[PDB]
Scaffold this motif. Structure first.
Motif, mmCIF file in Angstrom:
data_model
loop_
_atom_site.group_PDB
_atom_site.id
_atom_site.type_symbol
_atom_site.label_atom_id
_atom_site.label_comp_id
_atom_site.label_asym_id
_atom_site.label_seq_id
_atom_site.Cartn_x
_atom_site.Cartn_y
_atom_site.Cartn_z
ATOM 1 N N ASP A 144 -4.970 4.981 -9.731
ATOM 2 C CA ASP A 144 -5.616 5.121 -8.277
ATOM 3 C C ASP A 144 -6.095 3.721 -7.849
ATOM 4 O O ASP A 144 -6.120 3.513 -6.815
ATOM 5 C CB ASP A 144 -6.673 6.081 -8.578
ATOM 6 C CG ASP A 144 -7.443 6.561 -6.973
ATOM 7 O OD1 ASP A 144 -8.459 5.788 -6.620
ATOM 8 O OD2 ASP A 144 -7.056 7.389 -6.649
ATOM 9 N N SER B 204 3.818 -0.013 -6.958
ATOM 10 C CA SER B 204 3.216 -0.418 -8.059
ATOM 11 C C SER B 204 2.833 1.045 -8.778
ATOM 12 O O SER B 204 2.644 0.983 -10.125
ATOM 13 C CB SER B 204 2.066 -1.300 -7.774
ATOM 14 O OG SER B 204 2.348 -2.294 -7.016
ATOM 15 N N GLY C 75 0.813 -1.131 -0.011
ATOM 16 C CA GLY C 75 -0.100 0.016 0.052
ATOM 17 C C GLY C 75 0.970 1.098 -0.111
ATOM 18 O O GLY C 75 0.382 2.388 -0.133
ATOM 19 N N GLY D 30 3.139 2.228 -2.263
ATOM 20 C CA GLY D 30 2.639 3.056 -3.563
ATOM 21 C C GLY D 30 3.714 2.389 -4.595
ATOM 22 O O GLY D 30 4.160 3.380 -5.433
ATOM 23 N N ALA E 100 3.525 9.653 -5.685
ATOM 24 C CA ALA E 100 3.170 9.146 -7.122
ATOM 25 C C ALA E 100 1.964 9.987 -7.979
ATOM 26 O O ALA E 100 1.934 9.803 -8.912
ATOM 27 C CB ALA E 100 2.681 7.665 -6.958
HETATM 28 N N1 LIG Z 1 -2.870 9.424 -2.870
HETATM 29 C C1 LIG Z 1 -2.042 8.725 -3.131
HETATM 30 N N2 LIG Z 1 -2.265 7.325 -3.045
HETATM 31 C C2 LIG Z 1 -1.018 6.479 -3.757
HETATM 32 C C3 LIG Z 1 -0.121 6.834 -4.070
HETATM 33 N N3 LIG Z 1 0.734 5.911 -4.473
HETATM 34 C C4 LIG Z 1 -0.075 4.709 -4.645
HETATM 35 N N4 LIG Z 1 -1.130 5.136 -3.933
HETATM 36 C C5 LIG Z 1 -2.363 4.288 -3.616
HETATM 37 O O1 LIG Z 1 -2.133 3.137 -2.924
HETATM 38 C C6 LIG Z 1 -3.173 2.295 -3.255
HETATM 39 C C7 LIG Z 1 -2.152 0.819 -3.709
HETATM 40 O O2 LIG Z 1 -1.385 1.038 -4.767
HETATM 41 P P1 LIG Z 1 -0.612 0.029 -5.648
HETATM 42 O O3 LIG Z 1 -0.708 0.158 -6.982
HETATM 43 O O4 LIG Z 1 -0.956 -1.386 -5.046
HETATM 44 O O5 LIG Z 1 0.906 0.233 -4.839
HETATM 45 P P2 LIG Z 1 1.133 -0.890 -3.887
HETATM 46 O O6 LIG Z 1 0.429 -2.070 -3.727
HETATM 47 O O7 LIG Z 1 1.716 -0.265 -2.594
HETATM 48 O O8 LIG Z 1 2.821 -1.405 -4.586
HETATM 49 C C8 LIG Z 1 -3.913 2.687 -4.487
HETATM 50 O O9 LIG Z 1 -5.095 3.211 -3.910
HETATM 51 C C9 LIG Z 1 -2.830 3.812 -5.001
HETATM 52 O O10 LIG Z 1 -3.531 4.842 -5.865
HETATM 53 C C10 LIG Z 1 0.415 8.227 -3.751
HETATM 54 O O11 LIG Z 1 1.503 8.596 -4.241
HETATM 55 N N5 LIG Z 1 -0.620 9.194 -3.257
#
Ligand SMILES: Nc1nc2c(ncn2[C@@H]2O[C@H](COP(=O)(O)OP(=O)(O)O)[C@@H](O)[C@H]2O)c(=O)[nH]1
Ligand SMILES: CN(C)CCCN1c2ccccc2Sc2ccccc21
Length: 169
Positions: free
Chosen positions: A30, A17, A13, A15, A146
């Protein structure tokens, strides 16, 4: 053209990805499945050196610990991303550094501390707390987002140089 294998590590979570896709598709997502693991290749010329970046977005837990440790040994540069509004991820960065160091069996490992979600409020992790941790590891720390894409490119660019330093050492 030199090939660079980089792996982004962190909590589910933070970010990872999102940052990876921001460099590849150049657009923020998102909604994206965190369990979906995918590696992307991007040809970039930094410091006058054309290098192909192989960034892998891991999920977290693997079916076999063998391949788990394997994807941690092939990587030359590791990006440690945490959420400033989630101390749980920041504290996990401790075991992340420790684990990878034991997997590759080394003291000096090209890494960079990245604090994502800097645009969001409720900042639980202060800049000093992260800088202090980075200072202990001897690696750079950069706050990013991100969403607005602040320091996202710089973070990757810095990691590449971190790898280079270890290569010419
Ligand atoms: N507001 C905000 N949300 C983010 C940011 N980066 C990732 N997210 C959110 O984190 C959640 C999971 O993102 P994901 O692609 O699964 O990244 P990961 O699983 O942490 O590698 C989603 O709602 C993304 O949009 C960011 O920089 N700002
Ligand atoms: C399959 N190859 C074309 C890409 C492999 C990418 N890779 C990865 C990337 C960078 C450092 C370590 C690893 S280990 C790994 C694990 C799962 C999928 C791909 C990879």
């Amino acid at each position: 053209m030199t090939e660079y294998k980089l792996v982004v590590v962190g909590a589910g979570g933070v970010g990872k990805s999102a940052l990876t896709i921001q460099l590849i598709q150049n657009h923020f997502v998102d909604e994206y499945d965190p369990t979906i693991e995918d590696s992307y290749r991007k040809q970039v010329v930094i410091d006058g050196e054309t290098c192909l970046l192989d960034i892998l977005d891991t999920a977290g837990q693997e079916e076999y610990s063998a391949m788990r440790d394997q994807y941690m040994r092939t990587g030359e540069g590791f990006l440690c991303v945490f959420a400033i509004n989630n101390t749980k991820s920041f504290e996990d960065i401790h075991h992340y550094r420790e684990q990878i160091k034991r997997v590759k069996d080394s003291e000096d490992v090209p890494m960079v501390l990245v604090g994502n979600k800097c645009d969001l409020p409720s900042r639980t992790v202060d800049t000093k707390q992260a800088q202090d941790l980075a200072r202990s590891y001897g690696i750079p720390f950069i706050e990013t987002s991100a969403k607005t894409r602040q320091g996202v490119d710089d973070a990757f660019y810095t990691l590449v140089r971190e790898i280079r330093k270890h290569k010419e050492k």
